[PDB]
Amino acid sequence: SIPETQKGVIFYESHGKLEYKDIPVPKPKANELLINVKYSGVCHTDLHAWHGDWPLPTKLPLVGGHEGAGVVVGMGENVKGWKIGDYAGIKWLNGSCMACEYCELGNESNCPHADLSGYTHDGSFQEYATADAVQAAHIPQGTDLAEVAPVLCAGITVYKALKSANLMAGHWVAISGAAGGLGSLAVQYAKAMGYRVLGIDGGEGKEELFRSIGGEVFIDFTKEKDIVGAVLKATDGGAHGVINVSVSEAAIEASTRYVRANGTTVLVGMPAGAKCCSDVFNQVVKSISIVGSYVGNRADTREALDFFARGLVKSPIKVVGLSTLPEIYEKMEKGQIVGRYVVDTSK
Amino acid sequence: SIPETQKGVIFYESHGKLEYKDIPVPKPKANELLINVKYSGVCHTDLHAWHGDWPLPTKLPLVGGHEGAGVVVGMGENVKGWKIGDYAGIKWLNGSCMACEYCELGNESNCPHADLSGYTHDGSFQEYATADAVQAAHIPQGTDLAEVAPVLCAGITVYKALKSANLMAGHWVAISGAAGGLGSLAVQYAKAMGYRVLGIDGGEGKEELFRSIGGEVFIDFTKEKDIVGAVLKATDGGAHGVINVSVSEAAIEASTRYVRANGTTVLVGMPAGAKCCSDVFNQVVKSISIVGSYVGNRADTREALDFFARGLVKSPIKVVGLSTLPEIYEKMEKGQIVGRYVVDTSK
Amino acid sequence: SIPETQKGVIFYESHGKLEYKDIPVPKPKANELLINVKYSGVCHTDLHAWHGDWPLPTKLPLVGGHEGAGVVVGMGENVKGWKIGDYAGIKWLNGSCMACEYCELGNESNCPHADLSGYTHDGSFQEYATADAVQAAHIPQGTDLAEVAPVLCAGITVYKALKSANLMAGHWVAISGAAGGLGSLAVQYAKAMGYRVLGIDGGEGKEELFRSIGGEVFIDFTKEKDIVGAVLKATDGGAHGVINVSVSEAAIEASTRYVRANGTTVLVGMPAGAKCCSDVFNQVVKSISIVGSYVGNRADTREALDFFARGLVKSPIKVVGLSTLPEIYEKMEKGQIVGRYVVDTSK
Amino acid sequence: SIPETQKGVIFYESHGKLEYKDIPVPKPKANELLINVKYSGVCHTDLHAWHGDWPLPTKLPLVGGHEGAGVVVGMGENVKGWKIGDYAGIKWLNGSCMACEYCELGNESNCPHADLSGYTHDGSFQEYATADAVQAAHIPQGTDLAEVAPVLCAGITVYKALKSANLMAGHWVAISGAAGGLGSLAVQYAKAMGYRVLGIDGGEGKEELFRSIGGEVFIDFTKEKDIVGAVLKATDGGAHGVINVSVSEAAIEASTRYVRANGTTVLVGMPAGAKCCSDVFNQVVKSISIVGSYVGNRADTREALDFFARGLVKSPIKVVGLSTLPEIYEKMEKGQIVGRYVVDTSK
Ligand SMILES: NC(=O)c1ccc[n+]([C@@H]2O[C@H](COP(=O)([O-])OP(=O)(O)OC[C@H]3O[C@@H](n4cnc5c(N)ncnc54)[C@H](O)[C@@H]3O)[C@@H](O)[C@H]2O)c1
Ligand SMILES: NC(=O)c1ccc[n+]([C@@H]2O[C@H](COP(=O)([O-])OP(=O)(O)OC[C@H]3O[C@@H](n4cnc5c(N)ncnc54)[C@H](O)[C@@H]3O)[C@@H](O)[C@H]2O)c1
Ligand SMILES: NC(=O)c1ccc[n+]([C@@H]2O[C@H](COP(=O)([O-])OP(=O)(O)OC[C@H]3O[C@@H](n4cnc5c(N)ncnc54)[C@H](O)[C@@H]3O)[C@@H](O)[C@H]2O)c1
Ligand SMILES: NC(=O)c1ccc[n+]([C@@H]2O[C@H](COP(=O)([O-])OP(=O)(O)OC[C@H]3O[C@@H](n4cnc5c(N)ncnc54)[C@H](O)[C@@H]3O)[C@@H](O)[C@H]2O)c1
Ligand SMILES: [Zn+2]
Ligand SMILES: [Zn+2]
Ligand SMILES: [Zn+2]
Ligand SMILES: [Zn+2]
Ligand SMILES: [Zn+2]
Ligand SMILES: [Zn+2]
Ligand SMILES: [Zn+2]
Ligand SMILES: [Zn+2]
């Protein structure tokens, strides 16, 4: 059944030309498993991977995409817990070494041999892609794969962020950039986890979408000038935890000021070489923690997909065929991502 | 017995002239209690208070000192748990409002009405000083008050820092500035708490004193150039938690790079208007937390004084009379603090 | 304005006769504050206090009630943070010594000098009652005092329990006794905190009320025989955290078996001298934690009253006059508490 | 080099006769790896496995032993992170499914498909034994394998226990049964982690050995009658965390009474069908947590072996040949284990 060739967009030279062609099927190593990828999201990480600008060297030739979702067609002889026909998800972190120290502690994303899907491994921009049998996401049966694709890297990231913010149910969380592709999932996850969301975003239709997905207070970062004072006024003391999913370094810097004392400031957005210069005196006096957060581990994956299965979170996807993926990249690096451009592999 | 006047160094105008004179005894408010201060430490915080440069306005006239230790002579009618003749310690945070939200959570140092001793309240540079009956430190009987004076603001600070670093016994902690007045207490507390200390300091005799108080690995920040690589080599991956007690902003910036992934970087030293510009990408990818830490709360006070009572920590004090306190300040802002200039009130 | 006498139900001899009479006003000690109690709840704790059967000796003569809510008429000279006319709540733990070790750590309810309201202090069954200025609850203005009365000991208890269960949003919590006076508030707080509630109760109308206040799965402990298997079937592995608000020791014992491995079993209900004999082998192998939980501290008080202010939790109170309080006790020790018999002080 | 047969003690029928004979070499599955076991400890768990009395059915025929340590001779094709000639340790939990929910969270010991070494898998009582490449312990090179054998199940267990006790450096920990084979390692680990050890044991030479390995206070459970009062007197309020490594159910019951309020009581010893009947009222009022603790996970393994590598913990082993293993079992079920009967495989 597995066709000896599949369709996919691959590129050989970094920042080169996305060639939609046919490629042999990756065979599943004894530990890996093959996935007939049905849909796949796209995010800034795929741009950075195709650029090659990030410090780690991208394994070329490379088929991109780290937010893939599909059905298992063939597993490795060593695999257990998986069955054929199951719904699996190729996350960003493809496979870790399961033998260092971070792999053991749970933070698998920092393994010095972290095989990154779509960066150092065949990504999720093909009809069939291989992925580690342990790190793959157990997408529950019957789920709408196209709808769940963005949750696999975006939703998991914001969920691990919120868990890293050290918030208690009823506290104030400020999603700096709540209308964005990450911000909307962050707001939904925060409202589901019991926090009180305070979005900070601006532009056209942003506040409307934010009210739609459910948010207590909205702060337009274009109309309101003193954002810090506005947040301190709304939350009455500062947000108990901020999530910097925005891309403006200025917004990150301003985030370390409207966070309540003893609060937390999760850094998630990774703008182009920015610095989080917080006033060391103001940070010490108020004991403000500025935590970073990479893609979540397996437990976070399971819990985020659980939150999705209960219909709590929703992603306004825009299904698009795979053949036009180069045009998708072109509009992406120009900033045309409106909701979330989930790609379709069959098309 | 309480003399209607006591000796003390007071100053009326910020950055003015330290007048050693006689002052009426502060009467203990129903909640406060009076303390015949026997000894008192000095630290950069007292310099900043006498300057007035810090944002909060210093209550003038002001008798300085926030690291005082003495014997209770008279308590307020409302006070309970205290007895006359007990050994009490005037910490930095004199009295909080015990009715807001941070006071309740335990982080009393952030109360918007935090009465700061020696900054907004009569400090510990007098024969007799009043202090809150709740925040005062319960110095155990028989303790050498002169020896315990530095533990009251320095030791408590580094202990709350180490507790904030989220380390487990056996991890690697890098005390950036281990030979300093804060660094030595930090190293002793870390070794007592089970961590593996890695000091980062330099100068004359620093490494010798560091080996004396007990430290695994020392890194001279003047001879060694690539500090980051050196720490990564010694700790084999990065220190599980860094404590930035140094005053060089450059050292703080370099600290966010030799901290192990998923580690922590407690900011304690408050240099003159510095910025902790950490590479947001490197901080996110490795999930490095940069936590701040102010003076510890009451529980930290009790635990740190307990560590001192078991003879685990030691402070190389230099007892000096109170009369020469202006000269002490003069040599201090010139940088003549060698070990820790603990002052004597009687002298 | 303060009348030199007020109405109240007092009793002199333990398990004696509840005399509704007039009593002089308690004067507020410099640390305490007076409260014109407007309403007050009742719970099994008041029965146990009136019996005197509990080990601690009840201060006689004693006016009962530990769930009082009223308006501040006069505060002590030492009090700060409070204003006249504010809405305050007399919780169970009236005043702690704020000088021992548990008081410092936050667990004030275990202070060896814990002044227990209605047990060792003048309770909340009078028109005017005094209460500690620190431990009193800051009931927000405009709140319906009669509605908030049960939240002051019941709601706070179940909230501290759920926080002690160590659950993450999306986990399974089994409120053993969900329909009871404590169980309903527990279910509401759990649903608000993001958990997935699984009630275990039975009787008449219980499941209907449980569906009303919002609960995923209900297990009738009278119709269903194998409760353990039923819970394991519903939660698919065991509830991530159980809350034993029931009074049947058998139910507590059965609770240590349907809790998921690595889960938790908060003990809250205090039946008449029961034992939690859990199979030590089964508890070890599955690493099941059986945590206890007394009344919450000040932070829990603030957070629970916050959850109430957002209209998330609701208590089906039954306002009853104070004059009939003896009949209330009589019907109580016979088991006639239907919803929650909140008493009215004016009536 | 791998001999087609090796020596080993195997038994076919539960509670049967230990036959020392020759057995074919287990071949390493693609995920497993073979280990030329050099030494191996023995503990009550091996008795229970040979009995078959434990609920899980023991895979027969079965070679016992779960505390093995040896050198890797041949790894599976899929294995990464391991090299030939490395020092590996066969712990109790041989291999988990790494695909359920507990495996993901880190608590691998509760996987419903937890392959238990020496219970459901070929144990460590043979010259060569296979073990999972992930769960195997990375014994550092040059370590004295005979000395490290007991640390592989005993030391890891007590370390995970102490970590589960939720203690802070400087607190009081009561090792109920400090002189025993588990108690001695517990005391050493506690002293290394910074806690203040208070042993509770009795018999001949017990207190002497306890003073030897380093313990603050010792309580003879045979001479002293009121153990609870004695511990409350020594620790001044109750031990902040108790570790019930003893086998007397009476001692476990007595443990839930001398634990300080808000403390913890780790259950580790698994006596023959015992019950931890704690007074539910006393447990609630003091909020005493009774946590269980099975064998630690991989992170605990690494940290415990690290504590061993720094020479902090030591096990008084008694090297004995493998041929006499049946006599070892016979003396064991009669209670002749004096220190720790580490077996030698070559002999
Ligand atoms: N850490 C991870 O694992 C991970 C994974 C995926 C994406 N990311 C990061 O997510 C970001 C992209 O998120 P997205 O898809 O929502 O991007 P987007 O560009 O689609 O949306 C960004 C949002 O930021 C808002 N914004 C812009 N300037 C702002 C300001 N000054 N203050 C507040 N909000 C402001 C915009 O209005 C918009 O709502 C990138 O930084 C990317 O690297 C991180
Ligand atoms: N947060 C608080 O509650 C609190 C309280 C008291 C003091 N402090 C802070 O403590 C600091 C003073 O500490 P101290 O008394 O030890 O000061 P100190 O000047 O006596 O010693 C500072 C130490 O830093 C070392 N150092 C200098 N440059 C360094 C570099 N580049 N890298 C590493 N180490 C370097 C020095 O050699 C010395 O050992 C100040 O920042 C002060 O504000 C904070
Ligand atoms: N720890 C504290 O701070 C604190 C404070 C207040 C009350 N409490 C405890 O709360 C309890 C009273 O709660 P309440 O007011 O809801 O009591 P209640 O008697 O009004 O209700 C008890 C509930 O338990 C249910 N139940 C009975 N048998 C059961 C069984 N076998 N399994 C499951 N559920 C069963 C009943 O149907 C009912 O829903 C008492 O134990 C009291 O001491 C504790
Ligand atoms: N949970 C796990 O992963 C795990 C692993 C291995 C062993 N264990 C358990 O460890 C226990 C064996 O430990 P050991 O090897 O030290 O056993 P042992 O029999 O060699 O020593 C037991 C100790 O308990 C002491 N003791 C006896 N009665 C006591 C009492 N009333 N109060 C206090 N102390 C008392 C004895 O004097 C002795 O010091 C068994 O329960 C076993 O199942 C658990
Ligand atoms: Zn790894
Ligand atoms: Zn993504
Ligand atoms: Zn306050
Ligand atoms: Zn100081
Ligand atoms: Zn107290
Ligand atoms: Zn109550
Ligand atoms: Zn599993
Ligand atoms: Zn063992």
Tokens of A165: 């913010």
Q: Quick check: B137 and B222 in contact, CB under 8 A?
A: no
Query: Torsion over CA of B8, B11, B16 and B20, rounded to 10 degrees?
Result: -20
In whole angstroms, give the CA distance from residue C9 to residue C59.
Answer: 15
DSSP B167: -
Query: Max CA-CA distance within chain C?
Result: 64
Compute how many other C-beta atoms are within 10 angstroms of the C-beta atom of residue B115: 18
Compute how many other C-beta atoms are within 10 angstroms of the C-beta atom of residue B1: 5
Candidates C172, C284, C286, partner chain D, best to mutate (most D CBs within 10 A): C284
Evaluate the CA torsion angle A198, A199, A200, A202 in order and state its sign: negative
In whole angstroms, give the CA distance from residue C140 to residue C70.
Answer: 11
Among A128, A91, A181, A139, residue whose Cα is nearest residue A309 = A139
In whole angstroms, give the CA distance from residue C243 to residue C233.
Answer: 18
**Which residue matches tokens 């945590």?**
C291
Query: Torsion over CA of B77, B83, B88 and B93, rounded to 10 degrees?
Result: -30
- Residue A281, min C-alpha distance to chain C (Å): 27
In whole angstroms, give the CA distance from residue B340 to residue A140.
Answer: 63
What is the distance between the terminal CA atoms of chain D, rounded to a whole angstrom? 19
Helix (H, G, I), strand (E, B) or coil at C148: helix
Compute how many other C-beta atoms are within 10 angstroms of the C-beta atom of residue A273: 10
The residue of chain B with its CA nearest to that of C77 is: B30
Kind of pairing between the strands at C32-41 and C67-75 = antiparallel
Q: Which residue CA neighbors atom 14 of ligand 3 most closely?
A: C181
Q: Rounded to the nearest 5 degrees, what angle is found at the Cα of D74, between the Cα atoms of D72 and D79?
A: 90
Rg (CA), chain B: 20
In whole angstroms, give the CA distance from residue A199 to residue A233.
Answer: 14
In whole angstroms, give the CA distance from residue B282 to residue B260.
Answer: 11
Tokens of D93: 């939990």
Q: Quick check: B321 and B347 in contact, CB under 8 A?
A: yes
Residues C5-41: b if buried by 16+ CB within 10 A, e if exposed: ebbbbbbeeeeeebeeeebebbebbbbbbbbbbbbbb
**Which residue matches tokens 């603990």?**
B342
> Which residue(s) pair with C239 in the sheet?
C259
Q: Quick check: D37 and D126 in contact, CB under 8 A?
A: yes
What is the distance between the terminal CA atoms of chain C, rounded to a whole angstrom? 19
Whether B92 contacts chain A with CB within 8 A: no
Q: Quick check: B33 and B74 in contact, CB under 8 A?
A: yes
Give the amino acid at C101.
E
Give the amino acid at D263.
G
Q: B267: which chain A residues are within 8 Å (Cβ-Cβ)? A: 280, 283-284
Ligand approaching nearest to the C-alpha of D206:
4
Among B89, B38, B92, B87, residue whose Cα is nearest residue B65 = B92
- Residue D138, min C-alpha distance to chain A (Å): 9
Residue B140: is the preceding peptide bond cis (ω within 30°)?
Answer: no
C170 torsion bin: left (phi>0), alpha (psi -120 to 50), beta (else): left
Q: Rounded to the nearest 5 degrees, what angle is found at the Cα of D83, between the Cα atoms of D294 and D117?
A: 30
In whole angstroms, give the CA distance from residue A42 to residue A329.
Answer: 9
Q: Quick check: C166 and C265 in contact, CB under 8 A?
A: no
Evaluate the CA torsion angle C37, C38, C44, C50 in order and state its sign: positive
The residue of chain A with its CA nearest to that of B273 is: A281
> Which residue(s) pair with A9 in the sheet?
A20
DSSP C159: H
Task: Catalogue the long-range contacts made by C207-214 (C-beta closer than 8 Å, 24 or more residues apart).
Answer: C207/C179, C209/C179, C209/C184, C209/C316, C210/C178, C210/C179, C210/C184, C213/C184, C213/C187, C213/C188, C213/C314, C214/C187, C214/C188
In whole angstroms, give the CA distance from residue B39 to residue B345.
Answer: 6
Sheet holding B172-176, edge to edge: B217-220, B196-201, B172-176, B239-244, B259-267
Please state the separation of Cα B172 from the chain's center in Å: 22
Please state the separation of Cα D333 from the chain's center in Å: 17
> Which residue(s) pair with C227 in the sheet?
none
| Spacing, Cα C152 to ligand 10 middle (Å) | 7
Q: D297: which chain A residues are within 8 Å (Cβ-Cβ)? A: 104
Tokens of B281: 């990408």
Q: Give the Å distances, CA to CA, from D242 to A317, D173, D289.
A: 53, 5, 10
Contact assignment for B168 to D303 by CB distance below 8 Å = yes
Query: How many residues are listed for chain A in this entry?
Result: 347
| Spacing, Cα B181 to ligand 8 middle (Å) | 10
What are the DSSP E strand ranges found in chain C?
5-11, 19-24, 32-41, 62-63, 67-75, 87-90, 93-95, 115-116, 128-132, 137-139, 172-176, 196-201, 217-220, 239-244, 259-267, 320-321, 343-344
Q: Rounded to the nearest 5 degrees, what angle is found at the Cα of A27, between the Cα atoms of A56 and D80?
A: 55
**Which residue matches tokens 């918007």?**
B112
What are the DSSP E strand ranges found in chain B?
5-11, 19-24, 32-41, 62-63, 67-75, 87-90, 93-95, 115-116, 128-132, 137-139, 172-176, 196-201, 217-220, 239-244, 259-267, 320-321, 343-344
Q: How many Cα atoms are found within 13 Å in the side-chain-facing hemisphere of D19?
A: 11
In whole angstroms, give the CA distance from residue D16 to residue D19.
Answer: 9
**Which residue matches tokens 């007939």?**
A36
Whether B44 contacts chain A with CB within 8 A: no
Rg (CA), chain C: 20
The resolution, in angstroms to one decimal, equals 3.2
Give the amino acid at A189.
Y
Among C197, C151, C191, residue whose Cα is nearest residue C176 = C197
Question: Is A287 known to sit in a ligand binding site?
Answer: no
What are the DSSP E strand ranges found in C91-151?
93-95, 115-116, 128-132, 137-139
Kind of pairing between the strands at D115-116 and D172-176 = unpaired
Residues A11-25: b if buried by 16+ CB within 10 A, e if exposed: beeeeeebeeeebeb
Query: φ, ψ for residue B320 (rounded to 5)?
Result: -135, 145
Angle between helices B298-309 and B154-164 (to 10 degrees): 110
Compute how many other C-beta atoms are within 10 angstroms of the C-beta atom of residue D244: 33
Among D136, D144, D181, D149, residue whose Cα is nearest residue D65 = D149
In whole angstroms, give the CA distance from residue D52 to residue C326.
Answer: 61
- Helix/strand/coil (H/E/C) assignment for every residue in chain A: CCCCEEEEEEECCCCCCCEEEEEECCCCCCCEEEEEEEEEECCHHHHHHHHCCCCCCCCCCEECCCEEEEEEEEECCCCCCCCCCCEEEECCEEECCCCCCHHHHCCHHHCCCCEEECCCECCCCECEEEEECCCCEEECCCCCHHHHHHHHCHHHHHHHHHHHCCCCCCCEEEEECCCCHHHHHHHHHHHHHCCEEEEEECCCCHHHHHHHHCCCEEEECCCCCCHHHHHHHHHCCCEEEEEECCCCHHHHHHHCCCEEEEEEEEECCCCCCCECCCEHHHHHHCCCEECECCCCCHHHHHHHHHHHHCCCCCCCCCCEECCCHHHHHHHHHCCCCCCCCCEECCC
In whole angstroms, give the CA distance from residue D297 to residue D286.
Answer: 30
Task: Catalogue the long-range contacts made by C227-236 (C-beta closer than 8 Å, 24 or more residues apart).
Answer: C227/C200, C227/C254, C227/C258, C228/C254, C228/C257, C228/C258, C231/C174, C231/C198, C231/C200, C231/C258, C232/C258, C234/C198, C235/C172, C235/C174, C235/C198, C235/C260
- Residue D65, min C-alpha distance to chain C (Å): 18
Question: Is A182 known to sit in a ligand binding site?
Answer: yes
Tokens of D304: 């415990």
Helical residues (DSSP H) of D167-324, grouped into ranges: 181-193, 206-213, 227-235, 249-255, 280-285, 298-309
**Which residue matches tokens 């053949």?**
A323
Sheet holding C172-176, edge to edge: C217-220, C196-201, C172-176, C239-244, C259-267
> Which residue(s) pair with D89 in the sheet?
D69, D137
Which helix (H) or strand (E) covers residue D21, if one does? strand D19-24
Q: How many Cα atoms are found within 13 Å in the side-chain-facing hemisphere of C347?
A: 11
Which helix (H) or strand (E) covers residue D68, if one does? strand D67-75
In whole angstroms, give the CA distance from residue C44 to residue A130.
Answer: 61
> Which residue(s) pair with D266 in the sheet?
D243
Task: Catalogue the long-range contacts made by D300-303 (C-beta closer than 8 Å, 24 or more residues apart).
Answer: D300/D156, D300/D159, D300/D160, D300/D163, D301/D89, D301/D91, D301/D137, D301/D152, D301/D156, D302/A101, D302/A104, D302/D137, D302/D138, D303/B168, D303/B170, D303/D159
Q: Rounded to the nearest 5 degrees, what angle is found at the Cα of A124, between the Cα atoms of A119 and A125?
A: 100
In whole angstroms, give the CA distance from residue A139 to residue D195.
Answer: 44
User: Helix, strand, coil shares of chain B as percentages rounded to 5?
Assistant: 30, 25, 45
- Residue A205, min C-alpha distance to chain C (Å): 28
Residue D61: is the preceding peptide bond cis (ω within 30°)?
Answer: yes
Among B255, B285, B286, residue whose Cα is nearest residue B268 = B255
Tokens of D256: 């839930």
Q: Exposed (0-12), middle (13-18) or buried (19+): which is B260, by Cβ within 10 Å?
A: buried
Query: Torsion over CA of B59, B60, B62 and B65, rounded to 10 degrees?
Result: 40
Angle between helices A181-193 and A298-309 (to 10 degrees): 80
In whole angstroms, give the CA distance from residue A177 to residue A192.
Answer: 18
Compute how many other C-beta atoms are within 10 angstroms of the C-beta atom of residue B164: 23
Atom from ligand 2 closest to the CA of residue B206: 39
Q: How was this structure determined?
A: cryo-EM
In whole angstroms, give the CA distance from residue B266 to residue B323.
Answer: 37
Q: B135: which chain C residues are within 8 Å (Cβ-Cβ)? A: none
> Which residue(s) pair with B21 in the sheet?
B8
Query: How many residues are listed for chain D in this entry?
Result: 347
In whole angstroms, give the CA distance from residue C329 to residue C335.
Answer: 9
Q: Quick check: D14 and D124 in contact, CB under 8 A?
A: no
Residue A150: is the preceding peptide bond cis (ω within 30°)?
Answer: no
Q: How many Cα atoms are found within 13 Å in the side-chain-facing hemisphere of A226?
A: 5
Whether C208 contacts chain A with CB within 8 A: no
What are the DSSP E strand ranges found in B122-256?
128-132, 137-139, 172-176, 196-201, 217-220, 239-244
Rg (CA), chain D: 20
Atom from ligand 2 closest to the CA of residue B48: 43
Give the amino acid at C294.
Y
**Which residue matches tokens 């870390």?**
B190
Among A311, A321, A320, A254, residue whose Cα is nearest residue A288 = A254
- Who among D107, D237, D280 is closest to C271 (CB)? D280
Query: φ, ψ for residue B197 (rounded to 5)?
Result: -80, 140
DSSP D310: T
Tokens of A24: 């042999």
Residues flagged as binding site of B for Zn(2+):
43, 66-67, 97, 100, 103, 111, 153
Give the amino acid at C302.
R
Contact assignment for A261 to B110 by CB distance below 8 Å = yes
Q: Quick check: C289 and D290 in contact, CB under 8 A?
A: yes
In whole angstroms, give the CA distance from residue C192 to residue D235.
Answer: 40
Q: B169: which chain D residues are within 8 Å (Cβ-Cβ)? A: 169, 192-194
Kind of pairing between the strands at A67-75 and A87-90 = antiparallel
Evaluate the CA torsion angle A107, A110, A114, A117 in order and state its sign: positive
Helix (H, G, I), strand (E, B) or coil at D44: helix
Q: Which residue CA neighbors atom 11 of ligand 2 most closely?
A: B269
Query: φ, ψ for residue A319 (rounded to 5)?
Result: -65, 130
Q: Quick check: B240 and B193 in contact, CB under 8 A?
A: no
Q: Rounded to the nearest 5 degrees, what angle is found at the Cα of B275, between the Cα atoms of B271 and B279?
A: 140
Task: Catalogue the long-range contacts made by C101-105 (C-beta closer than 8 Å, 24 or more residues apart).
Answer: C101/B299, C101/B302, C101/D237, C102/D261, C102/D262, C104/B297, C104/B298, C104/B299, C104/B302, C105/B299, C105/D262
Rg (CA), chain A: 20
Among D294, D297, D305, residue whose Cα is nearest residue D103 = D297
Helix (H, G, I), strand (E, B) or coil at B197: strand
Query: Torsion over CA of A231, A234, A236 and A242, rounded to 10 degrees?
Result: -40
Q: Give the Å distances, CA to CA, from A326 to A17, A20, D4.
A: 8, 8, 58
Residues 6+ away with beta carbon under 8 Å from B101: A237, C302
Q: Quick check: C242 and C178 in contact, CB under 8 A?
A: no
- Who among D164, D252, D261 is closest to C102 (CB)? D261
In whole angstroms, give the CA distance from residue C276 to residue A268.
Answer: 45
Q: Quick check: A187 and A207 in contact, CB under 8 A?
A: no
